[PDB]
Amino acid sequence: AVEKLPEDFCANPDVAWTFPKVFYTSSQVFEHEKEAIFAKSWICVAHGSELAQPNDYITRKVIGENIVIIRGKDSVLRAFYNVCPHRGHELLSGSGKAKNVITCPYHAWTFKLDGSLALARNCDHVESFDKENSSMVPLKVEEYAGFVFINMDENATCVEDQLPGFAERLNQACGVIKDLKLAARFVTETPANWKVIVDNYMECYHAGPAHPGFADSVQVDKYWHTTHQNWTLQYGFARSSEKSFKLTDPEFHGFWTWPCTMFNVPPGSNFMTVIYEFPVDAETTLQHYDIYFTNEELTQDQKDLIEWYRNVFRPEDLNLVESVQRGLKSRGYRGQGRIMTDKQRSGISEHGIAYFQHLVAQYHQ
Amino acid sequence: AVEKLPEDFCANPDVAWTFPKVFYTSSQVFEHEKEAIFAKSWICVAHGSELAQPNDYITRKVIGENIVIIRGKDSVLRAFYNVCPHRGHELLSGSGKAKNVITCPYHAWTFKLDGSLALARNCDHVESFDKENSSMVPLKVEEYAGFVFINMDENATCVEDQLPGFAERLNQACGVIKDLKLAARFVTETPANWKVIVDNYMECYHAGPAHPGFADSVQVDKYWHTTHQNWTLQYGFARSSEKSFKLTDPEFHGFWTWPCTMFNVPPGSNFMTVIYEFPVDAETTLQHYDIYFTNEELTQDQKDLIEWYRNVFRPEDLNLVESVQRGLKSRGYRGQGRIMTDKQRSGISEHGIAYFQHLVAQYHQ
Amino acid sequence: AVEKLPEDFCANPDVAWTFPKVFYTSSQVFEHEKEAIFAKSWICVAHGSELAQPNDYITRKVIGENIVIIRGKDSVLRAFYNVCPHRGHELLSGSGKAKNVITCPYHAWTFKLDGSLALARNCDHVESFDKENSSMVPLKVEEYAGFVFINMDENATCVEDQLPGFAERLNQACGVIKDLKLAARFVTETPANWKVIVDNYMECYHAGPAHPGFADSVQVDKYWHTTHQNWTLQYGFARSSEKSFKLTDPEFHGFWTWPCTMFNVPPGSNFMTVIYEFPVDAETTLQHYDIYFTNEELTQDQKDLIEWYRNVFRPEDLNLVESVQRGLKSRGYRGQGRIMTDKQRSGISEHGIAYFQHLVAQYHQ
Ligand SMILES: C[N+](C)(C)C[C@H](O)CC(=O)O
Ligand SMILES: C[N+](C)(C)C[C@H](O)CC(=O)O
Ligand SMILES: C[N+](C)(C)C[C@H](O)CC(=O)O
Ligand code: FES
Ligand code: FES
Ligand code: FES
Ligand SMILES: [Fe+3]
Ligand SMILES: [Fe+3]
Ligand SMILES: [Fe+3]
């Protein structure tokens, strides 16, 4: 039988438990989430800076789809499936400046940067060849909140419909987003269900016992997790730390947005880090951890901070979700886990997980 | 349809064939054996020495279950699933001395060494929190014959009920078991069904043509394979060998015990080797090959003997079961293989396989 | 439901599309092709030279079957499944000179080079032992066109019935086949469905934009693709090239033969290259690329030509089929691809793919 959840699941965060374990492991559940969620939701893939000039392009992979996003020669941003309409060879790789046409490496069909077939050698001698039905196949792309979202659902509306108020709130958290520049990217294929990874972001319960240096800057004594409409916001005061961030009143901002992209405006509010979750299968999630600074020339504090994120901070969260994925298959882990919400909605309250899982639940009725 | 065997399968070792090949490869058969056998049988995991002191612990993995076995501060031996009752993080890794409490690396819940939840930060502010239903989840553990068995079946009786007479017989084979100390462990994930591996132990037919040095010490001319009640015993005379064991009348003892742990009391009778089979899936078996000596300081003969087991002896049996697993999927291997039992029950008689497979058969009615 | 194709599929190459994508990826489709095609078709495995002397043997692996082909002491060529009739251990490995008997490494049963059981130790003391039903299990083998084919279907006729006229045509393309000697073998497990790989051979559309040096010798301006009866022939003029073949009127011959072996008689017509496709699963194909020269002592031109094939030529075709396999799973690749046939049947016409896929289609009614 299809694994279905009650609509009220996690509707009361004061008395709630995570999903039954079959939702973090089941291949059947993933195929449903893959199609009902990730193929019909707006997926954040990059900061605007990576696509701000004509011919700039990037490629991404999410739920088995190789996607190209490319700023046309006409400065129009478009996105395409990265597969040739003739025999299915891939078209571009990596990121960079596209040439003025896209030439498929197999049979050298050409496409304008708008996906239109330009020249397909010998096509005028092939009977009934359909040039207009031989273009690159597009999908939707939207620049929102200074970032770039794709949608595989032709009928999708816009990213504001999916995250009402988010751009408005993020621009109050960070006023320099348009100026940010990608400083560093950690790519990691992570053996954990995408929802386990959102779980791990939605709470600060684990800060003290898992993250020394971070918990020393970001004071979770003054910390609140507000829920909204398909996103939430964690904010807290902070001070200079020699185990994380160093050097008036520093602040921390942590937005989770549906389905699984998270935006961080750490202390100082002049830079961002962004976690991108690109699910592969039920126990596999590709993660981008991006560090953005407004200056292209990095200071040492920024580079050192980068290495701190790579070697110290991120490995503690990688190690955590990977062990959780292993443990929740054990017959000793009885089904579900308790979400440690408190009435006060304290800094260590886990109520964030319940808002998230209640939304997920609506895709399993 | 479910693959079922006749109850008389291999009930007459004089005229018997191994399982139809689907029993060494089928994923469906493994899931049944995993649940009907390995989750309801006593599984040997270690010698008593590894758990003789308060706070000593070991971890094992069998049929997808990470297990912790730990001698309490109160000297009581217990075993637990190695997963935290809160979010499912794993609790301990490796082996060693546990601290006085078990602290989960994720959210720092604490547990006494008896599994009881000690302190779960913020729990007194979570509504309806169930502290007694938040302890580590236990399973059964028993010290028998100087070794340690776990059972995932709450209702299990004891290891003597599963191997009647075995401790009695093993203590006559080796009188120094309580004094043994783990001298060396070879860990190998082996691409062979667990039953293929028992198959390879249950006969001496292959000694001559596969194991020069061993067959030169253990004379299989004076060799008998006795069956009992869920175990069997292979014993034979031996002499000093410069290709295996060197330096009144040396003896060899080889006990197979249900489902798949084997105890060896090689010539001299003052040490043991033990094969532990921890099945992973239908074509995958984790193996521990343990060498135990009563002295902690190894002589060179013992260390050299260890290396002999690692580099010479064990690889010949690893290579054998791995090729068999490959070969029995071939359409040229017609279904089953003949068990070369002789009327005399000679040293090279394969009748041991039939006793084993007849017992396995009782789980496929 | 079973994926079935119309019998007329690709019967009109002027208006045709490749298979719906499920035929290059489906596990169910592969199991059918594996059994309805590869277990009932003649499979080319080697040149005659590798098996021309008594006791010469080779092993191959195709669709999960380890096969031994061995020239008896009596000079009779035979083929066997490479698995022992007793316990299923593999019998021979690699290629070389077999001893006068085949001794199984496990229990030392012996077999004459004709598969007959010779001596099975202790067999005269095993009740009802069936020596005649304990021989190596054979399959059909045929030397045709100077090469060696196996057939897993006991009832198969001969290779000429499956490729009428092929030996006759190949001997007109190359008159020195009996003199060829294996100069080099590239083994590659390729992540592409076997049909994708045949696809890539059946056309010259991609020569210009994917293979500089080759397209500079083999002029595809004078190039024709003739279809026949379960094989096709691509031939073209050529000239000396410093980017492929160097140094009266050079010719190129390229035979595809059912199901997926291809024979090349490149310019000069004094050597051959042969592609052997041994499918593993729906997205996996083992490939042998063999270079044959009539001299055992290689000149430098020949060795340099070999390295050209290894490092330059073959990687461009490996990279192509591997990207195609990735791309055709994308939801952006809409189902099928157009086969760029022209009325003229030009050198770049893709009509070859349609002949091939029409034959494949007959196995999915
Ligand atoms: C939201 N919070 C603070 C729990 C997680 C961190 O923001 C993770 C991160 O900054 O990369
Ligand atoms: C029982 N017997 C002798 C066949 C197998 C060997 O005991 C294997 C071993 O000693 O490790
Ligand atoms: C038939 N053709 C020329 C398209 C493919 C090439 O023969 C491939 C090869 O020579 O290895
Ligand atoms: S697959 Fe792109 S041009 Fe042929
Ligand atoms: S998972 Fe163990 S304390 Fe939270
Ligand atoms: S498996 Fe070949 S002799 Fe036993
Ligand atoms: Fe964290
Ligand atoms: Fe052995
Ligand atoms: Fe090519």
Author numbering:
A (entry chain A), B (entry chain A), C (entry chain A): 3 to 249, 254 to 371
Article, verbatim:
Rieske monooxygenases undertake complex catalysis integral to marine, terrestrial and human gut‐ecosystems. Group‐I to ‐IV Rieske monooxygenases accept aromatic substrates and have well‐characterised catalytic mechanisms. Nascent to our understanding are Group‐V members catalysing the oxidation/breakdown of quaternary ammonium substrates.
Phylogenetic analysis of Group V highlights a cysteine residue‐pair adjacent to the mononuclear Fe active site with no established role. Following our elucidation of the carnitine monooxygenase CntA structure, we probed the function of the cysteine pair Cys206/Cys209. Utilising biochemical and biophysical techniques, we found the cysteine residues do not play a structural role nor influence the electron transfer pathway, but rather are used in a nonstoichiometric role to ensure the catalytic iron centre remains in an Fe(II) state.
